[PDB]
Ligand binder design. Structure first.
Ligand SMILES: [K+]
Ligand SMILES: [K+]
Ligand SMILES: [K+]
Ligand SMILES: [K+]
Ligand SMILES: [K+]
Ligand SMILES: [K+]
Ligand SMILES: [K+]
Ligand SMILES: [K+]
Ligand SMILES: [K+]
Ligand SMILES: [K+]
Lengths: 130, 131, 130, 130, 130, 128, 125, 125, 128, 130, 130, 130, 130, 131
């Protein structure tokens, strides 16, 4: 069990890493093309596909001049058979504002994973917090 | 068989939402895994584990007829992950009567994750944002 | 055209009359069962069917019979064949507040009508404003 | 009818891209000369004709990348020559400071088949002005 | 001439004050238009809009009000039409019985049909229904 | 019949935004009156009060501006008098290039003299 | 000219009194029928005072008025102008004493032996 | 009495002009040395106008003044009272045209053949 | 010498809060003047303006009230005139029983006539 | 008598306006007291408090100010002391050169020592150092 | 190790239980009399002894008519030898407000324990959050 | 001196309990008749004597349980007959609604040994008024 | 007494003079090394030694030599033997803001002095106000 | 021996506070247990574990001379728990120069827990409230 929960923890860390670096290629590689997302930026609408996030990679997140640290705190992993997983955690984002003063942001994240063709694929996420 | 499964998920999710609406904590526990986790605005950004946190709301806020309420599930999107795993995401509109008796409306976004154990669907994780 | 446009004005006036009265039975008759609606009380979501609207008739507009007057201001009508119409207008709703002071509320309304089996049926509405 | 619903989808997509690209010539091509419009920039008034929108094409839309996405389109078909499409629209843009923002609007657009071509006869938009 | 326009205009205002809707309808063309603050910046046609204010306030209150027509200016265009413009001062009592005053600017257009002057358009700017 | 009043009224509105005081005087009876927000609730008589705004604004600030009369209602009173009432939508650019829109309600009274329509009174409420 | 100035204060004092108690017939006797008035209740317009004030006498009217620093301009045998700060002490329906200040200009004309009020200008309250 | 009323408007018009351009010597010629004034700049006090206004002529003073609805009370051969709304169109240092309204009462006295300003009362701006 | 001015000034202050208009008149020259906030910036002359406040307040609202002159400064000018300036602290109960404290600054000018000090002018700033 | 108190009081105010601290000290008793808004509700003794305002503002600015003494009231108590009370109006220019006006109420007490009047106490209420 | 961390978890649960019930006796029994506390109610001062908390037991917390649930989330326990422990956790308080509407509060708590005479004693606490 | 510092502690504690109990007789007993006081209720003024404080004893302190605690007292000894004690004071009380509140003040109290008895000669309190 | 009280006034005036000048060297000489202080910039805490005060001399009152005047208003002095004194007064600090406008600040000050080896030493201060 | 121990705790806590003041992350790690936990306002009410969260602040905000600062430890209270465990609680006043160069002041309350491992004190938990 625990080895499989650490498997989900690893790929989710890699997923958050592509967000911090702005690596949309690795982000796409880990996401199922038909994934859905509930996100504050989407104004309460469910968004399907990776278009809504590509616009954030191409602009705000590719400004990689700034440094960012994303901490996953106390991830709770639900295993549902050998093929499905759901991980839930508090996400702490450390970044620099305009002027270079360090600041932190909190968001709660639920991410659902399904293993398709022997590879973990991210099929649905839900984030709350600005 | 996936089309029939999606309708099984919608119905059991509908029944979970009405058990909450009527404060039916006996049916709520019937449908929930004992180790289910929850992100909801009432938990102030914390993940709560088990049905302990919700029991306080069933015992002190939800009666089977405390006030009229209408909970609409808008365009649910269902991910089926193999044979016995499902994720359903939907916008939920709540029509309620406020303190002054005025009909109002509230929107929340809900993800609910279900796992089928020994032939029955069990709720294992929910994430609610909004109202 | 002028006789056909006056037919759409008349059934639309009856629909708005049913709303002010609270007569949900006539409102239902004039609306196709699968009508859709954009209106502020839906918080930006498209609602289907008369289901969402029962709660506002049954728990309000029936209330305590205080006077409510509704006016269609200079309606614009688009005729699309002999079986379809779109009508758009400023709606002025006169009402009495808690206190008895006469007040006015403005909304912009788009209402789409379909001629189904002899009878005009309300198929889609879009309201913005108060 | 399934072919018709997809025709309404494509012609509505083409109208949205013409507004996003500031292409007033294509917008005029797809629009009936006597079309009406409820939209926030008109301050709660029904405007008729393309003259009101030409000011926004020439002096604005003709600047920065904009991502206009159509969410969950609902299409009512009234006969073979009339249609009404309603959807939520999410606009992704860069503000004055270049930071990506998102804005939601609800849109109703009514189309009329004229001489073998769909013609935009009425629109209703609620949400934030551009 | 001009004293006849001042006369009938005084009767109309006095009919408004008394809640005398019968004399008001007798003086007003049934197709008159009105620009008024209560209309929220819209042009209202007909007599039913004001009838709501008559039947639920002005005919409801015989409480003392005094209306002053200050230096009316009258344009006579031919023999059968006139336009009178004036400052209107309304003295009245508020909720606590305090005497209050309110200023509005009024334009009123009169058309003599069959020997009797008929009110066909009014424009009021200022405080609403005070 | 009503299309002539619409045409003459649009020309008066164009001459206002083009700072064209000459065309404005040609269409206005010299004894015209006006209720408008800039007059602070007073009735102003003649063409002198508007000249100050023609010289120091509508001319001086000439920029892309579009004025629309929305669904005008015309009262015809004989064959020599007319009252046109309409919502007036002003599309302009603010300092900074951002397109803006302003609404006002306008009543304008016209009188026909020697085959020419003359503007005798206006009333404007809303945006100043 | 302290003698004729003292008469203007006297007749102006009776005007305030007839106002201060709600007596309209004394007011109407002392006021020319074509009297004009600028005052805060007129919202910046010149008004015929008698038609405008009868509403305040039929409805609005422990009050103490006080005329501070009366300055009188004498103008022949027929007219005079008196300007002064007017202080008003009153009970505000809550029992509390309040004080209000207004500046008043009052013009008087003696047409047929009697002084009649011709024009007033009040500001401040 | 439209003839003698037209003269009061004329001399009052020259006063506004002498004020509107910053000419103090014309103002001083037309003003009685004991002229009094209520005006917003006096903060509710009656002031000798000539001593008070010279500061506004030495410092404060594209402007268009307009006298609306002048009402003139004639009072014998020596005095008259003129009341009117005064509209002022000006440039607010930002280039934008603004409009200000004031209500003015002006009392005039003809002592030695010439009309001299005796008392003014302005409110509103 | 200065203790006599302090004593007479305290008595005037006590008579003010006790609604004792009779003792107030005995200590005040009938031609006294007063600058105080209730007079809205005007100088009031005599004893009539204060009587309205004696009848409708300081009497009517008689309740526990303590008035303290804080470190009075006395200017002696001959043997017949005195000016005393001090912070005046008013301890009272509001509606509801809550003890409150108000401050004002007071100048009071006294003139000795026939062996008796007479109050000729006061100036108060601060709490109304 | 009283015109002598008005005279010396005018000189003092004119010394304040000119920043003329030498003439100010000559007119003021070195043990004078003052109640002033700038003192924040405290009684100040001596001349050094005002010297700060002289040395860092009034002697710093020859910018135009005009002071008006309105209807001074004077109490004469014997032969060697006087109290003058008056409204003071101060005309001046602000930062943008706008002419401004300010009212304060002033009481000033004068003691004639050795034939020369000496300022021993002042009380000012109103606007601070305007 | 883990059995000893569950030992600290147990007595800390019992400590929070006395707070929820208002049981000052059991609270005193578990606390060292010389314990210190950093608490928001103490306004940023360190408080020693159990006096500051007794006043809260005797009033707000002994109003046991209301129900309260106190959840200790993800306790992290530091063991420092066999005699000392430090537990840190997020504390969630569920309660009823005036009117009976359920509400939740969050506080972060650090609590230090020392085993004296074979019994765990609470020697120092630090709480943040209202 | 160690005995002296504990004498100052006890007599200061007795003064605080006399204020808390509203015992004006004991307060007068421990206070010098010419004592001075800076405290917020005096609005930033130095008051002399016990007369100012008698108003607060008679009309207030003479109601509800109050917990006045002395935090970290610092005592300066100046000879054998003079002392100055400074401390933070935390007041625990029930407001109008009975809910327990806490208030902080900083207190300096100066004591003088007179005729073999310590006498309170000066106090300075900053913080919130009672 | 009067000569002894004037000695305390003089050394206290020198201390306040050193503050306005920023002369930290004389300020140190007049202060006992272990003096304590209550002042607003300490956020309610009692600070010991001149340590806390170096940061405010060295980084401010030295600054750019703009004028600063300080006045002791009617000081009250308590003499406690021949070796101890407490002085209390309103302090008025005149200063120039950024912009050159003369402004005033008020504070209440208690300063306790100890005669140690011939020289007066400042042993405790308490300041409230600005 | 407890009096000497308390002064050891004060000194090592003083050194930890100056390593933070000068951004000395090499000394900070020397004094901290690798599994130390922290409650601080920057963590938004969350317990952070390890020195990872603080490393971002050393690397981007704390230099050895970025600005003058004075950190006063007010009246520390030290609990000694046996031979090799200590808890120190104190109010901390920070004197800093703000953006405009104005000298300001900030108060925080700090608990720091130390464990003596193989002869050296190691910081294992901190809780900061306030500024
Ligand atoms: K179950
Ligand atoms: K077309
Ligand atoms: K009629
Ligand atoms: K013309
Ligand atoms: K005009
Ligand atoms: K007397
Ligand atoms: K008086
Ligand atoms: K001198
Ligand atoms: K005693
Ligand atoms: K280490």
């Amino acid at each position: 069990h625990m080895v499989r929960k650490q498997e989900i923890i690893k790929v989710n860390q890699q997923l958050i890493e592509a967000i911090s670096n702005g690596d949309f290629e690795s982000y796409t590689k880990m996401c199922d093309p038909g994934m859905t997302a509930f996100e504050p930026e989407a104004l309460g609408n469910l968004v399907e596909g990776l278009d809504f996030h590509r616009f954030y990679f191409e602009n705000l997140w590719s400004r990689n001049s700034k440094p960012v640290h994303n901490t996953m705190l106390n991830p709770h992993i639900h295993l549902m058979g050998d093929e499905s997983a759901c991980i839930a955690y508090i996400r702490i984002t450390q970044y620099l504002d305009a002027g270079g003063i360090p600041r932190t942001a909190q968001s709660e994240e639920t991410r659902v994973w399904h293993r398709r063709d022997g590879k973990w694929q991210h099929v649905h996420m839900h984030r709350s917090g600005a």
